[model samples]
Target: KVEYSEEELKTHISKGTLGKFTVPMLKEACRAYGLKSGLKKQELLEALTKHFQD
Candidate 1:
């Protein structure tokens, strides 16, 4: 599994790491990470980052 920090995600997004992606992209990424998806915007970020942080 890919492990990363909150700021890491922030920087990546800010740097256009995903190129062009929406909430669903993030949600799918979350799913790939074995996390709970189907969440809203910030909710998904927090969920994914929280799960990753652990």
Candidate 2:
């Protein structure tokens, strides 16, 4: 299970936006989840979303 949730992510990222996670933060998440991090913003979102749900 994930050690945290969207709230935790939002706290680390900006609170004023939905997809506000920085590129580095997204990569960090990808790395933590053992997923590929070399993706564009849209791809990263989709990949991370799927991995987290799975």
Which tens-of-lDDT digit does each residue in 1-54 have in candidate 2?
A: 333345554443444332466676677666665777555675555556666445
Q: Candidate 1, residues 1-54: lDDT per residue as tens digits?
A: 233334556565555454245686676667656777554566666556565445
Best by lDDT: 1
Clashing pairs in 2: none
Give the local distance difference test score of model 2: 0.55
TM-score on alpha carbons, each prediction: 0.48, 0.53
Per-model lDDT: 0.57, 0.55
Report the alpha-carbon TM-score of model 2 versus the true structure.
Answer: 0.53
